């Protein structure tokens, strides 16, 4: 596997990177992003977000700073955990969390979090250059239905998708004062007019659910989703563009992820030759349990075959993770091309797996 960012080498003097991300482009183009976590490898710290773009499917790649924090605090300022998605038009977007003090986003303050927003950049030409940053959260102009008590939220880490006519959606996370305690729901947002204004959706059935991706199918929107301390990956399904949510048995447990926390996944939807809608899902099998996160394997469901089980399909990165911050993965598939990024010690690793697209697609 190629090391994509290597703390050991990078033009940044980086210590570690962490939260990869991955957008394989009409074009052949590769598109990645990473958190640039310059002195170490805490949540709480300096960071800004990098890209690499590869034009030689993945032998080499051109590395550039996509969004800097707000430079506030030199030693809390921090852009981070990307969400990124291509519309119909090929513009990427990429959202990210901003936040400038010490402290978890979403169980430190019993308030909005003064110091946090959403920050969106976007490019129009392919990932070369990127619009100024836009804040979507400092006024109501750019989120319709966010909830009075919103402590914070941002994407869901992985990537977003496009419906039929052309809607984006992006999978979030939330944390909502409830009660004289905070809880973290998973849920999403739409767009309607290329990424420059948006609707929040309702929270999923259950707290403790946080990072997450959905697929389209059929017009309903299925969600995989971290759910801390369950063990396993959720799952619900949406009828209406995620106002409402019930469990998605098909896939809710079906992905165990060991003792302990959860893990940021990937979930994304391919259609084989033979017509079938698979999804795909990337996450450690965390046999070892906690933070260790071992075993980054992926997934193949069938969801018009739904009688036949879960299959593991390799595992990209048969190794421990590192417990100081590991374990997190992004697929992305497009036009029977199958690639991963993910994290491997400090470093982001890529592969493709294309090959193993190719022993599901039986042509
Ligand atoms: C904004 C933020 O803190 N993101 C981080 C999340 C949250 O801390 C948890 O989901 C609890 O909220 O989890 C990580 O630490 C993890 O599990 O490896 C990494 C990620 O960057």
């Known amino acids: 596997p190629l090391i994509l960012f290597n703390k050991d080498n990078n033009i940044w003097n980086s210590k570690y990177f962490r939260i990869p991300n991955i957008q394989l482009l009409n074009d052949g183009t590769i ?18 977000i990098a890209s690499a773009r590869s034009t030689d499917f993945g032998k080499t790649w051109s590395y550039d700073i996509a969004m800097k924090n707000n430079r506030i605090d030199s030693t809390y ?3 981070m955990d990307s969400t990124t998605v291509i519309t119909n038009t090929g513009r990427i977007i990429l959202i990210a969390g901003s936040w400038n003090t010490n402290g978890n986003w979403a169980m430190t303050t019993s308030t909005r979090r003064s110091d946090w927003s959403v920050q969106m950049i976007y490019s129009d030409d392919n990932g070369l250059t990127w619009s100024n940053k836009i804040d979507l ?30 809607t984006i959606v992006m999978p979030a ?11 973290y729901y998973s849920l999403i947002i739409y767009s309607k007019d290329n990424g420059e204004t ?8 259950n707290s403790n659910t946080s990072e997450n991706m959905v697929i389209e199918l059929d017009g309903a929107l299925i969600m995989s989703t971290r759910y801390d301390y369950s063990g396993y990956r959720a799952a619900y399904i949406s009828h209406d563009l995620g106002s409402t949510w019930e469990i998605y048995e098909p896939l809710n447990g079906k992905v165990l992820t060991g003792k302990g ?12 030759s033979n017509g079938h809608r698979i999804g795909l899902i990337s996450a450690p099998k965390n046999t070892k349990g906690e933070y260790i996160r071992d075993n980054i394997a992926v997934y ?7 009688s036949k089980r879960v299959q593991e399909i390799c595992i990209p990165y048969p190794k421990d993770g590192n417990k100081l911050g590991g374990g997190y993965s992004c697929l992305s598939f497009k036009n029977s091309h199958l690639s991963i990024v993910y994290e491997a010690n400090g470093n982001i690793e890529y592969q493709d797996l294309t090959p193993y697209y190719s022993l599901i697609n039986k042509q």
């Open 198 to 205: 948006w609707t929040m959706g309702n929270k999923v059935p």
């Open 77 to 79: 300022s921090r852009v």
């Open 31 to 48: 598109l990645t992003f990473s958190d640039i976590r310059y002195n170490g490898p805490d949540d709480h710290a300096y960071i800004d």
């Open 300 to 306: 193949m469901i069938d969801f018009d075959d739904l």
């Open 137 to 166: 959260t400092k006024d109501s102009s750019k989120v319709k239905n966010q909830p009075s008590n919103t402590i914070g939220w941002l994407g869901g880490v992985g990537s977003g998708i496009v419906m039929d006519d052309g």
């Open 173 to 183: 996370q939330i944390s909502l004062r409830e009660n004289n305690e905070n809880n």
């Open 261 to 272: 926390s959860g893990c940021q996944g990937s979930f994304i939807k391919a259609t084989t």
